Amino acid sequence: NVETVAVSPTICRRGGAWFASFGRERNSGTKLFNISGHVNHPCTVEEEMSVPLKELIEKHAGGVIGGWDNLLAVIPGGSSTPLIPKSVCETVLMDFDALVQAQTGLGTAAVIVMDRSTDIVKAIARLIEFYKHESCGQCTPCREGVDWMNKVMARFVKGDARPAEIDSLWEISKQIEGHTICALGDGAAWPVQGLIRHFRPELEERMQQFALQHQ
């Protein structure tokens, strides 16, 4: 990485133990955090590793738009990582192990926050559409399954689908993840898994409203 290479000479000049002092064990050092989305002050700042997510947003980002109660979801490690709800991001640290314990993973520490005044399903569908537009198409799982997921995901925003499909979409991700050449298949399957796992009732509600409106 650019960050790793850039921080290596300072590690050499100041010592390895000084850099190892920061953070927890196996999570040492400082990190660049890009806080974006529904924040008052979207910004990139360097900070110690295992900062609580709420503390980091409250200090450096100026607070989530509409106050902390307006918070709905946060994607901590970029589009690849699964999203987490407000309940678990209240007291979650920012490193590899603790974020893995949140079923997400640290990734690139690129925080994207969404308040409750936005369509979360639309955002996840845009992420899946991006992944569809960015796959090289070399192997059949990533290529075909990511296109397939995108089509299913688009309907989900509309709610044109059924409750049975949500379970089916999950299995599709199980077929993408772990079977591709590179990790773009994993990075395209994980957002869907997180959205399903944490907002299945929202998908059910949208489907019910669509079924009512179209009779």
Ligand X SMILES: Cc1cc2nc3c(=O)[nH]c(=O)nc-3n(C[C@H](O)[C@H](O)[C@H](O)COP(=O)(O)O)c2cc1C
3-class DSSP assignment, residue 43: strand
Helix (H, G, I), strand (E, B) or coil at 44: strand
Helix (H, G, I), strand (E, B) or coil at 37: strand
Rule CB under 6 A: is residue 79 a binding residue for ligand SF4? no
104 binds, among ligand X, ligand SF4, other proteins, none (CB under 5 to 8 A by kind): none
CA 82 from centroid of its chain's CA atoms: 4
**Which 3 state secondary structure label does DSSP give 149?**
helix
Among 34, 42, 162, residue whose Cα is nearest residue 108:
34
Q: In the complex with ligand X, which residue's Cβ is closer, 116 or 133? A: 133
Asked if 148 interacts with other proteins (CB under 8 A), we say no
Rounded (5°) CA angle 57-59-61? 50
Q: Is 215 in the site for ligand X (CB under 6 A)?
A: no
Contact residues for other proteins, defined by CB under 8 A:
164-165, 167-168, 170-171
Contact residues for ligand SF4, defined by CB under 6 A:
135-139, 142-143, 180-182, 184-185
Contact residues for ligand X, defined by CB under 6 A:
1, 4, 182-184, 187
Annotated binding site: 1, 4, 108, 135-139, 142-143, 180, 182, 185
